[PDB]
Structure 1
Amino acid sequence: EDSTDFNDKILNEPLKHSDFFNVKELFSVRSLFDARVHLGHKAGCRHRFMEPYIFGSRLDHDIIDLEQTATHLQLALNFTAHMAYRKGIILFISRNRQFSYLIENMARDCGEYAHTRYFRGGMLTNARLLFGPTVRLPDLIIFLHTLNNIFEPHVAVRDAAKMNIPTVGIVDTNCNPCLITYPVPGNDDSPLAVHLYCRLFQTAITRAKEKRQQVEALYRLQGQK
């Protein structure tokens, strides 16, 4: 009797709004441009599945179309906020060691999880053996870098799909986005780009968790009286 009203006022209400958390106010094409998000790899490194998201090549250096990035980033941030609102487990994954420390801190601060270390065979597809039969896997995996250190796709991209976990991923021009649920074309190398991404996801996640508490608290106060 009271559960249907809970799920309707709290879980189903956010899904009726196009931007329930107002993640569009967090970034702009200019803010992305200042972080050098449009800078891609050289044309010789281009992946053919990234061609739709490329604005062009400036002297053999690919430029990422930030108009698309802004639209893709809006969806990825929106999905991430909704999953944080629903109290889903969010796991950040990246093998780029220049940013391992930064990413681990961002995860700890937002109350989520980070895996920046060597990824052992079967963390996702054999988790019950590795962790225990009652282990809960992540509900969302965010890749700040989708490639490993030998320039191949991070194994967790395939293994997240195998375990039916949606993935958000920054996809540079040499990356393969086919299996990434919510890809965001953007520069994955420059510290300004990576720092921006960590601020946006950290803020999206932190806002959605605070929104969940506000709604719950209001729903309880009104319930008693």
Structure 2
Amino acid sequence: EDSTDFNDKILNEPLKHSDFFNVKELFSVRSLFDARVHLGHKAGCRHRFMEPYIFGSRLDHDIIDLEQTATHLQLALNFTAHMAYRKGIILFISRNRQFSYLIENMARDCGEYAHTRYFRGGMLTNARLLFGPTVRLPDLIIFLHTLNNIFEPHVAVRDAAKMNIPTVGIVDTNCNPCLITYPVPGNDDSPLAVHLYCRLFQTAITRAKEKRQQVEALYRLQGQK
């Protein structure tokens, strides 16, 4: 009797709005351009499945079309915010050691999880053995870098799909986005780009958790009276 009203006012109401958390105010094509998000790798490193997202090559350096990044980033931030609102477990994954410390801190600050270390075989597909039969896996995996340190796709991209976990991922021009649920074409190398991504996801997640408490609190006060 009271559960259907709960799930309808709290869980289903945010899903009826195009931008319930107003994540479009967090970034702009200019803000992305200043963070050097459009800068990709040289043409010789281009991955075939990234051609649709490439604006062009400027003297053999691929340029990422920020008009597409803006639309893909909007979807990724929106999805990420909704998953944080629903109290989903968000796991950040990246092997880029220059940003391991930054990413681990961003996860702790937003109240989420980070895995920036060597990824051991079976963390996801064999989690019950490694952690226990009652272990809860992540509801969303966010890749700030989709490649490992030998320039291959991070094993968790394949294993996240095997476990039917949606993935958000920054995909540079040398990355393979086929299995990434919400790919975001963008520069993954420059500290300005990576720092921006961490600010955006951190802000999206922090806002969505605060929104969940506001809605719940209002739903309770009105319930008593």
TM-score computed with the length of structure 2 as normaliser: 1.00
CA offset at residue 32 of structure 1?
A: 0.0
In 1: Cα distance, 2:220 partner to 2:128 partner = 37
Deviation digits for residues 7-44 of structure 1 (CA, Å, limit 9, x no counterpart): 00000000000000000000000000000000000000
CA offset at residue 192 of structure 1?
A: 0.1
| Secondary structure of 1:138 counterpart | coil
CA offset at residue 152 of structure 1?
A: 0.2
Deviation digits for residues 73-120 of structure 1 (CA, Å, limit 9, x no counterpart): 000000000000000000000000000000000000000000000000
| Secondary structure of 1:221 counterpart | helix
In 2: Cα distance, 1:205 partner to 1:171 partner = 20
In 2: Cα distance, 1:35 partner to 1:88 partner = 29
TM superposition outliers: structure 1 runs of 4+ over 2 Å: none
In 2: Cα distance, 1:7 partner to 1:140 partner = 21
In 2: Cα distance, 1:13 partner to 1:32 partner = 31
| Secondary structure of 1:41 counterpart | strand
Pair 1:88-2:85 in alignment = no
Deviation digits for residues 151-172 of structure 1 (CA, Å, limit 9, x no counterpart): 0000000000000000000000
In 2: Cα distance, 1:219 partner to 1:43 partner = 54
Please provide the CA RMSD for this pair.
Answer: 0.1
In 1: Cα distance, 2:57 partner to 2:153 partner = 24
| Secondary structure of 2:179 counterpart | coil
CA offset at residue 147 of structure 1?
A: 0.0
CA offset at residue 200 of structure 1?
A: 0.0
| Secondary structure of 1:206 counterpart | helix
In 2: Cα distance, 1:182 partner to 1:41 partner = 21
CA offset at residue 183 of structure 1?
A: 0.2
CA offset at residue 204 of structure 1?
A: 0.0
Deviation digits for residues 157-211 of structure 1 (CA, Å, limit 9, x no counterpart): 0000000000000000000000000000000000000000000000000000000
CA offset at residue 52 of structure 1?
A: 0.2
| Secondary structure of 2:80 counterpart | helix
Deviation digits for residues 139-158 of structure 1 (CA, Å, limit 9, x no counterpart): 00000000000000000000
In 1: Cα distance, 2:153 partner to 2:73 partner = 21
In 2: Cα distance, 1:141 partner to 1:131 partner = 18
- Mind listing any 5+ residue stretches in structure 2 that lack a counterpart? none
| Secondary structure of 1:36 counterpart | coil
CA offset at residue 46 of structure 1?
A: 0.1
In 2: Cα distance, 1:123 partner to 1:48 partner = 29
Q: Number of aligned pairs?
A: 225
Partner of 1:190: 190
In 1: Cα distance, 2:142 partner to 2:196 partner = 14
Pair 1:161-2:161 in alignment = yes
In 2: Cα distance, 1:155 partner to 1:129 partner = 18
Partner of 2:142: 142
CA offset at residue 124 of structure 1?
A: 0.0
CA offset at residue 123 of structure 1?
A: 0.1
